Amino acid sequence: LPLDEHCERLPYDASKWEFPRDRLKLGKPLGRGAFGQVIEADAFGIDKTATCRTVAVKMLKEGATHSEHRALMSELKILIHIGHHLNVVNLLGACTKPGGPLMVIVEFCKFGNLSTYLRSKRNEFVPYKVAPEDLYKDFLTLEHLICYSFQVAKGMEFLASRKCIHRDLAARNILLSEKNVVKICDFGLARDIYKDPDYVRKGDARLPLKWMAPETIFDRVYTIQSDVWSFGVLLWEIFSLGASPYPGVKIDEEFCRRLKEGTRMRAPDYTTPEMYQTMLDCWHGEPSQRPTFSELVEHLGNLLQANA
């Protein structure tokens, strides 16, 4: 019973969210996308009185039509409804007044998307830091990876509590901020899905096939439990340190049939046995038999305390 299916009836409280365009200094593009783009900006006093703050701004670009403008307004309304959590990109304000573009402003996440980050830090990884050598080196450890996994499950549990589902959960839609904080986001229109190899043609649409549950590919069913399936794929990207899923597999009709029958990915190179078992559990063929995000939160939190 998803709330994000009927956004047009959600409210936009201008008196709280509206940010004056003259207090926003636009900077360099962080994207670009197809019909949308994300831009780095400096917002004056958006969340603390008279304080400059770097922010990320989503807006449309040349090629967008009034239908993308309606879609970005629905996105702003769903961000307001969802609200704030440490592990979700938090909405700071918006510019919706006539005479300028619609702009959605969110907190800036310094290190960008998790997929690119883990791939760039693949060489700087040690399962456990051993004293004294590694003590002053900023290496990625098994603890960090379990911690990112835990934070994404916490953010997903929060989203599910708001009666929302993601539909495109993947490491490319996770951002990394300071103090090892990860935030779920959705680039949407600001990602060029027509240039991106993670999106495969399926009818008239470009879909993230490698992250979709069998009931999504075959029956077009999207639920919180299909997001659990994508979470399992996200765990594989994390413990492969940013590798692309199903390596060497041609993403065609045969791949979908093999998946539907119970064929799964082998363990990634940096996983622990229990993290691989968590992946298999997220990839149960029956959606009801997959763990919930609340169960994943408890399990990953226990694993984090056991890894210490």
Ligand SMILES: COc1cc(Oc2ncnc3cc(OC)c(OC)cc23)ccc1CC(=O)Nc1cnn(C(C)C)c1
């Ligand atoms: C302005 O809005 C966005 C900005 C984004 O990009 C970035 N945001 C922050 N910092 C960044 C730093 C970067 O490099 C340093 C960056 O390099 C490419 C992109 C950055 C990504 C997505 C959105 C909109 C969005 O998440 N909408 C949405 C709808 N539903 N939900 C639910 C909660 C899942 C989320």
